[PDB]
Design a protein around this ligand. Structure first.
Ligand code: CLA
Ligand code: CLA
Ligand code: CLA
Ligand code: CLA
Ligand code: CLA
Ligand code: CLA
Ligand code: CLA
Ligand code: CLA
Ligand SMILES: CC1=C(C#C/C(C)=C/C=C/C(C)=C/C=C/C=C(C)/C=C/C=C(\C)C#CC2=C(C)C[C@@H](O)CC2(C)C)C(C)(C)C[C@H](O)C1
Ligand SMILES: CC1=C(C#C/C(C)=C/C=C/C(C)=C/C=C/C=C(C)/C=C/C=C(C)/C=C/C2=C(C)CCCC2(C)C)C(C)(C)C[C@H](O)C1
Ligand SMILES: CC1=C(C/C=C(\C)CCC[C@H](C)CCC[C@H](C)CCCC(C)C)C(=O)c2ccccc2C1=O
Lengths: 742, 170, 69, 129, 42
């Protein structure tokens, strides 16, 4: 029983004393401010626990309680989304008429004329149109009334109180010891089996006993208040049998392994529900049940307290061949003693999963009536692409912090890390070459096309009409997925997604999904994507691999993760740290995700979204101009940015005038950021000297001596305002455009 | 040692007869986490409100003031929400509760017993021994009335008859 | 839809077979613990029988799929 | 230690707390005692306003089982405080008689409910008919 | 009230947020009761 619970009782006293002493957590800051830099230095390093404390136990305790605090904030946020849906929304009107009422769960107060933002969203309601897709989530859950939304808001509030209590309790009353946190096998067993498997299983039970009957009654056309309450499905099996007759047999088919009895509600239909334009909820129920079994089985892999199971260290140490030295030896010790190494992995995975979520949710729209709510589809794609890109760059930020701080060569002799660092010149030179080749042969095709179109030579272009770059591999994969139902997935009835090919799905005379054809423009923008992803990897990988030392600075690890430079010598070593590669790689992340969301926005408006009409023909939002105009830069400038900025710039005096104002405000903030990015600290310190003189003249100089921001903070302020302004401008443009036309 | 009330439950250990009416009953362990002066403040405040409420529920059945219309106490709540009297009662309670906040801070700082507001106009507490028995009776009545008020309101909901008339009928 | 069958003694047979198979095979393969009377305890029995119901359920469903039953 | 016939063939006692096992067994014993004595008593005589298994759903609709669940749930919350504090730290014949009659009651109740599945009847009714 | 909690409420970010929230609140109230004051009325 070496996996055991071990707790220190009453470690830290619940006192307001250290609240009154800002900077108490570090020896430098606790002696008080003398310059304004102290103030910035206070906020910058506060959650950097391993810079204040030496011991891994106290660091682990602070992290566990901070995770409860984050959970409390998320639960309060969810409770507020449910409360605003219950109290300030037109959810009931939306349930009666989804394809006509526009969701709105935010109402403004009348103060300075701002009540113009309460536009006519429909259903006898005035408010701000919301695009988070909560209404479709609630309808998929089977909510059907505001009263149940009040109970969900209360459940969120109770959970939020329980998490903030638990964070206090587990830091101040009962803090686990380090040997409790250093149980990776136990934690994985419980998080796979218990967190994921039970979670999937419990959700599958809700879908089978609540979501599936309520939604079958809704899609038959029954009014929401005419639908029986969800517990009458739980007790009276006769009504559930009337909807799905397999329930007449109960749990005998489950236990005797006669599982094909349950095919009424555990289907493998594929495709979309024609009524709602969403995934079949019988498919999602079978999906969650299948995942639950796999996750619970996965949870029995690792050894905890009874001899069955794997040792994770033995698995890692056995995988070594003739190219890779000692192999994965020493990685277990890293990943159970370094929090930063774990955060680097988990941030890269969370970001990757968020980008996958973004792709899978527009192509296989899971919620009822979310496919034809085009503002929601554009919003949730753009949001999860930005979360993915940010989390992916934070994985490289904390890989750099690991290398600078937690990496020790004595325990990493001739293993995989040692070998990567010992051929990092070959890695970065080959990646650098790939980024040059791929920028020439992706963006230079655009420059070739602009020049030929400008010269009158349209036969010399890379286009469908002229020289053709055909995405043959992607077209072939689309063919395979269209041929799959009945062939390589024989029990499937429809394709996984209509994007691959097949029918046009229309809901409320709007296209839910239809095949997304690929041509020369799709080949070109996909290689644009491959190029922007490659260089972002190069900037972040070069920062992680050269974080400790280079040919330039042989002792970079002694300066730390975040230092501004090592002086003007050696020609100049400005921005040589690992932090400065995270700083430079967030710009290239911004560039990559901006072209991805622009590609999505133009391609869906041009070729997928639109209104079905007589004869079955479809009129798209921008009328199929992507194919012949996404091949030049002038086409993107004119037919995408200029043509679609009409709604944001003409929005004044309407309910979308808020987007019109945020468009300008973010354009302003973006420009304001370049003051911090193009300038240097020394100018601003000398300007502050003359302003200090004028304060000295009037005897009003402060005792906290004003300083220009540090070199690193100047870079961080410039990057933060750059990201805010660029993303905010895209946010305002995307939302005003798709609310007006979609 | 074991709890006096529940023989098989252990004594909580923050409850050693410091507060009158203690019988060692605290299974969920709120005194192991929270301040007992604050909890006894809350127990006596909830109990005093409940004791007044039960007396009000019965007397309001027996008599009502001539200037107000006759009606049942839950309907009285809704009528005085819309009439303005409820806001007056809420305001004056809130006004007294301001100096109650000051009183609770004085209790936390150690210089006041949790339910003591020095409210003895009629001098009933003649001696210290009389006060101990009286505050035991206050604690017991306060707890009993919390249970009682819940019963009257919930039964009124389930069967639309007032407490004296429900005893009178059935 | 793949065809499954109501429980019969053949389904019981497949379950019993897979269960005994997993006892013996697990007894050799498991690396931490009189062929079955040395060091055989409840977690080993419960693990071999859990893999037995996994192998047996897969075997029953597959043999029902192909027609062997 | 009471009712120790040396019968632990699978050796569950090695891989679960003996106190937890005894408290669970004595709870199972007493619940089945009440259930079996009640099972026969329901057919012997009946309370006013009022089979073996169908009566569960005939009783839930009134709200009787919900009420009994609420009160057992209250007692079981105090009993989970009891078992946690048990676990965190001329009469022996009477305990042994309790444990034996309780194991017998578990067998008897199991018998009556499956006999109900066999014939749709209660225990002593089956004996009479 | 505890002197260390009152010393926390005297810290610069708390006083800054409270003072400008109070300032924002009486500008909002003045523009609620007296809106569209383009000129000093005289
Ligand atoms: C967590 C997310 C969240 C968000 C973003 C919002 C956002 C909003 N809510 Mg909602 N709300 C939420 C959760 C949320 N709410 C929850 C959980 C509940 C349930 C209790 C509600 C219940 C609710 C109601 C009942 C109403 C709103 C309203 C509003 C709007 C105006 C709020 C306002 O100006 O009041 C401002 C109110 C003040 C008292 C101003 C306080 C400003 C202080 C100074 C902030 C200071 C914080 C402090 C200094 C932090 C440090 C602590 C200290 C010790 C130092 C706004 C759109 C209003 C609305 O929609 O009207 C149409 C409305 O009436 N909300
Ligand atoms: C079955 C057991 C189980 C479960 C469910 C969890 C669940 C969780 N752990 Mg883990 N953990 C476990 C065992 C378990 N742990 C063990 C054995 C150890 C020791 C090795 C750890 C050590 C550990 C650490 C060190 C950390 C976590 C963290 C977390 C949270 C991850 C963030 C998240 O997704 O939360 C959001 C998702 C939710 C579903 C929120 C649910 C909140 C409750 C707690 C879930 C369980 C409630 C209860 C079982 C359900 C009753 C159901 C009933 C109504 C029928 C999550 C609540 C992290 C964290 O955030 O800490 C707070 C963290 O830092 N865990
Ligand atoms: C954690 C998830 C969860 C939860 C709490 C429940 C809970 C319940 N299910 Mg559901 N169920 C679930 C997952 C879940 N199920 C999954 C994943 C499946 C797919 C295999 C089913 C399929 C299912 C069926 C087919 C039936 C239930 C039934 C029931 C009820 C059990 C009644 C019983 O024992 O007699 C069961 C009947 C016998 C003859 C034995 C209960 C409300 C039964 C019920 O009462 O229907 C409302 C019922 O017939 N469930
Ligand atoms: C689960 C996620 C997670 C976690 C736990 C951490 C945790 C940590 N990071 Mg990592 N990081 C993450 C995600 C995460 N980060 C991501 C996604 C990125 C990519 C951008 C990074 C990039 C990164 C770098 C580059 C650095 C860290 C550092 C740190 C540490 C210090 C934190 C601190 O004191 O900041 C205090 C917090 C602040 C000062 C907050 C201000 C930040 C912005 C400007 C405010 C947010 C703006 C808001 C959202 C929008 C405003 C609205 C506007 C319209 C007004 C801590 C270990 C630092 C370090 O040195 O550690 C050793 C460090 O240099 N991280
Ligand atoms: C429009 C602005 C712009 C342009 C063109 C570039 C161009 C480049 N950057 Mg820079 N960068 C920019 C803005 C820009 N950046 C900004 C704002 C930042 C701020 C954070 C950075 C930060 C940055 C970093 C941190 C990195 C780059 C890298 C790169 C290179 C990528 C490799 C490549 O595509 O080679 C191909 C070249 C191009 C696509 C440029 C256009 C050339 C086209 C095809 C026309 C060619 C015309 C031809 C030569 C004419 C010949 C005749 C003429 C002489 C008369 C390339 C040199 C990376 C690098 O060097 O890795 C290789 C790298 O690590 N950049
Ligand atoms: C001594 C200070 C004081 C004052 C000036 C008021 C003033 C008022 N109270 Mg309040 N009130 C007070 C103390 C006070 N109250 C206290 C201590 C209580 C006990 C908590 C109440 C409980 C109370 C209730 C329950 C009601 C009022 C009502 C009224 C209104 C009476 C209307 C009227 O004049 O016609 C009547 C004139 C007389 C009765 C002459 C005497 C007026 C707003 C009534 C009202 O209409 O509210 C809008 C009402 O229903 N008050
Ligand atoms: C000897 C008995 C036996 C038999 C005849 C089968 C036969 C089959 N199994 Mg089963 N299976 C068995 C034992 C058996 N399995 C065992 C012991 C396990 C471990 C638990 C599994 C686990 C298993 C899973 C998890 C699944 C199958 C599936 C399948 C079928 C489709 C395989 C295929 O063509 O996909 C080809 C797919 C490819 C990607 C090929 C390229 C096939 C008929 C699959 C199925 O469709 O069931 C309906 C499925 O999902 N099997
Ligand atoms: C745990 C076993 C058990 C269960 C589930 C039930 C359940 C039921 N019985 Mg049966 N019954 C029991 C024991 C049980 N009884 C016993 C021991 C007797 C003999 C006295 C009877 C005699 C009996 C008759 C004669 C009748 C019922 C009836 C009923 C129904 C209505 C509820 C009622 O009046 O309870 C009656 C139960 C009792 C009088 C004794 C209950 C035993 C204990 C004290 C209750 C447990 C709850 C307890 C307060 C909390 C736990 C604390 C614990 C440590 C003591 C319901 C089907 C009536 C009915 O609807 O039939 C159609 C009916 O006519 N039962
Ligand atoms: C402090 C102080 C003073 C004072 C004062 C004052 C105003 C004191 C007033 C004290 C009061 C009002 C005490 C009332 C307690 C009520 C109880 C115990 C509940 C009983 C009901 C039960 C048990 C029931 C029931 C039932 C249910 C639920 C529902 C029914 O269908 C059935 C049924 C009836 C059986 C004064 C001013 C004198 C001066 C002094 O110097 C200091
Ligand atoms: C919202 C609304 C209103 C309202 C209202 C109000 C005031 C509603 C009332 C709420 C109250 C006081 C509920 C009381 C519950 C007490 C219980 C369940 C006792 C449980 C004891 C148990 C389980 C056993 C206890 C145990 C046993 C064996 C006995 C001994 C003790 C113990 C060992 C602990 C109005 C009227 C204003 C109308 C308005 O327009 C809207
Ligand atoms: C303007 C500028 C300054 C001076 C900027 C200073 C001194 C910031 C002071 C602004 C006031 C004092 C605080 C700003 C508060 C704003 C109202 C917004 C607050 C945002 C949150 C931090 C609250 C630099 O120090 C600098 C250093 C390196 C490269 C570029 C630059 C640079 O461009």
């Amino acid at each position: 029983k070496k996996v055991s619970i071990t707790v220190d009782r009453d470690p830290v006293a619940t006192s307001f004393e250290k609240w009154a002493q800002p900077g108490h957590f570090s020896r430098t800051l606790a002696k008080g401010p003398k310059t304004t830099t102290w103030i910035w230095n206070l906020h910058a390093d506060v959650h950097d626990f391993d810079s204040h404390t030496n011991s891994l136990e106290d660091i682990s305790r602070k992290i566990f309680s901070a995770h409860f605090g984050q959970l409390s904030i998320i639960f309060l946020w969810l409770s507020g989304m449910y409360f605003h849906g219950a109290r300030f929304s037109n959810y009931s009107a939306w349930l009666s008429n989804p394809t006509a009422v526009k969701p709105s769960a935010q109402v403004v107060w009348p103060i300075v004329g701002q009540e113009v933002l309460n536009g006519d969203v429909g259903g006898g309601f005035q408010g701000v149109q919301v695009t988070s897709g909560f209404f479709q989530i609630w309808r998929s859950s089977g909510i059907t009334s505001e009263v149940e939304l009040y109970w969900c808001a209360l459940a969120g509030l109770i959970m939020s109180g329980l998490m903030i209590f638990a964070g206090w309790f587990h830091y101040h009353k009962a803090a686990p010891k380090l040997e409790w946190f250093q149980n990776a096998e136990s934690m994985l067993n419980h998080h796979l089996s218990g967190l994921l498997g039970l979670g999937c299983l419990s959700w599958a039970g809700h879908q089978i006993h609540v979501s599936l009957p309520v939604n079958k009654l809704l899609d038959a056309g029954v009014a929401p208040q005419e639908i029986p309450l969800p517990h009458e499905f739980l007790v009276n099996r006769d009504l559930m049998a009337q909807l799905y007759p397999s329930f007449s047999k109960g749990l005998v088919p489950f236990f005797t392994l006669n599982w094909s009895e349950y095919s009424d509600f555990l289907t493998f239909k594929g495709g979309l529900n024609p009524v709602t334009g969403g995934l079949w909820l019988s498919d999602t129920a079978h999906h969650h049940l299948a995942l639950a079994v796999l996750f619970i089985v996965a949870g029995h892999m690792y050894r905890t307290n009874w001899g069955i199971g794997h040792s994770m260290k033995e698995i890692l140490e056995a995988h070594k061949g003739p190219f890779t030295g000692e192999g994965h030896k020493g990685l277990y010790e890293i990943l159970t003693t370094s929090w930063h190494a774990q955060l680097a992995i988990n941030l890269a995975m969370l970001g990757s999963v968020s980008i996958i979520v973004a792709h899978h949710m527009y192509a296989m729209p899971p919620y009822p009536y979310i496919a034809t709510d085009y503002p929601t589809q554009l919003s949730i794609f753009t949001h999860h692409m930005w979360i993915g890109g940010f989390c992916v760059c934070g994985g490289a930020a904390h890989a750099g912090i690991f290398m600078v701080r937690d990496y020790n060569p004595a325990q990493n002799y001739n293993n995989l890390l040692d070998r990567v660092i010992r051929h990092r010149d070959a890695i970065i030179s080959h990646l650098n070459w790939i980024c040059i080749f791929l920028g020439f042969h992706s963006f230079g095709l655009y420059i070739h096309n602009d020049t030929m179109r400008a010269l009158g030579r349209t036969q010399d272009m890379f286009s469908d009409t002229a020289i053709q770059l055909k995405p043959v591999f992607a077209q072939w994969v689309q063919s395979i997925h269209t041929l799959a139902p009945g062939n390589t997935t024989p029990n499937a009835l429809a394709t996984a997604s209509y994007a691959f090919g097949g029918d046009v799905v229309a809901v409320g005379n709007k296209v839910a999904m239809m095949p997304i054809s690929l041509g020369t423009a799709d080949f070109m923008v996909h290689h644009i994507h491959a190029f922007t992803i490659h260089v972002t990897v190069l900037i972040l990988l070069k920062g992680v691999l050269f974080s400790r030392n280079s040919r330039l600075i042989p002792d970079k690890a002694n300066l730390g993760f975040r230092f501004p430079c090592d002086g003007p010598g050696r020609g100049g070593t400005c921005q040589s740290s690992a932090w400065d590669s995270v700083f430079l790689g967030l710009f290239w992340m911004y560039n990559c995700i901006s072209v991805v969301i622009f590609h999505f926005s133009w391609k869906m408006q041009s070729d997928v979204w639109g209104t079905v009409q007589s004869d079955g023909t479809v009129t798209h939002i921008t009328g199929g101009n992507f194919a012949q105009s996404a091949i030049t830069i002038n086409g993107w400038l004119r037919d995408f940015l200029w043509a679609q900025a009409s709604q944001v710039i003409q929005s004044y005096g309407s309910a979308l005038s808020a987007y019109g104002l945020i468009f300008l405000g973010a354009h302003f903030i973006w420009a304001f950021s370049l003051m911090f990015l193009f300038s240097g600290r020394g100018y601003w310190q000398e300007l502050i000297e003359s302003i200090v003189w004028a304060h000295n003249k009037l005897n009003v100089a402060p005792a906290i001596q004003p300083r220009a921001l540090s070199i690193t903070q100047g870079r961080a302020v410039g990057l933060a305002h750059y990201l805010l302004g660029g993303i905010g401008t895209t946010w305002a443009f995307f939302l005003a455009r798709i609310i007006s036309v979609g | 040692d074991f709890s006096a009330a529940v023989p098989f439950l252990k004594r909580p250990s923050n409850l050693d007869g410091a507060y009158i009416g203690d019988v060692g009953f605290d299974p969920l362990g709120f005194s192991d986490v929270f301040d007992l002066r604050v909890l006894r403040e809350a127990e006596l405040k909830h109990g005093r409100f409940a004791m007044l409420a039960v007396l009000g529920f019965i007397v309001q059945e027996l008599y009502t003031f001539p200037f107000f219309p006759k009606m049942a106490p839950v309907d009285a709540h809704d009528y005085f929400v819309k009439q303005g009297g409820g806001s007056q009662i809420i305001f004056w309670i809130s006004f007294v509760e301001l100096f109650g906040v000051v009183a609770l801070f004085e209790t936390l700082q150690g210089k006041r017993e949790p339910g003591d507001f020095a409210f003895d106009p009629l001098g009933l507490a003649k001696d210290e021994a009389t006060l101990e028995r009286y505050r035991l009776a206050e604690v017991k009545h306060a707890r009993l009335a919390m249970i009682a008020i819940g019963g009257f309101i919930h039964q009124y909901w389930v069967t639309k008859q007032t407490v004296l008339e429900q005893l009178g009928n059935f | 839809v793949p065809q499954t069958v109501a429980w019969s003694a053949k389904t019981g047979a497949v379950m019993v077979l897979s269960n005994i198979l997993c006892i013996v095979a697990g007894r050799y393969v498991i690396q931490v613990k009189s062929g079955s009377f040395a060091g055989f305890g409840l977690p080993e029995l419960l693990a071999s029988t859990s893999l037995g119901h996994i192998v047996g359920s897969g075997a029953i469903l597959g043999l029902s799929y192909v027609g062997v039953l | 230690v009471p009712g120790d016939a040396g019968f632990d063939p699978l050796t569950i006692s090695a891989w679960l707390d003996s106190r937890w096992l005894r408290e669970a067994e004595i709870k199972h014993c007493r619940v089945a005692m009440l259930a079996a004595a009640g099972c026969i008593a329901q057919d012997i005589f009946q309370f006013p306003g009022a089979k073996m298994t169908a009566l569960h759903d005939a009783a839930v609709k009134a709200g009787s089982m919900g009420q009994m669940l609420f009160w057992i749930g209250f007692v079981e919350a105090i009993s989970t405080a009891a078992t946690i504090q048990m676990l965190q730290g001329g009469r022996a014949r009477m305990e042994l008689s309790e444990i034996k009659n309780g194991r017998l009651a578990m067998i008897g109740f199991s018998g009556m409910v499956h006999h109900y599945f066999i014939t749709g009847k209660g225990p002593i009714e089956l004996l009479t008919s | 009230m505890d002197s260390n909690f009152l010393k926390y409420l005297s810290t610069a970010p708390v006083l800054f947020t409270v003072w400008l929230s109070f300032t924002a609140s009486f500008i909002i109230e003045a523009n609620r009761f007296f809106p569209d004051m383009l000129y000093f009325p005289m």
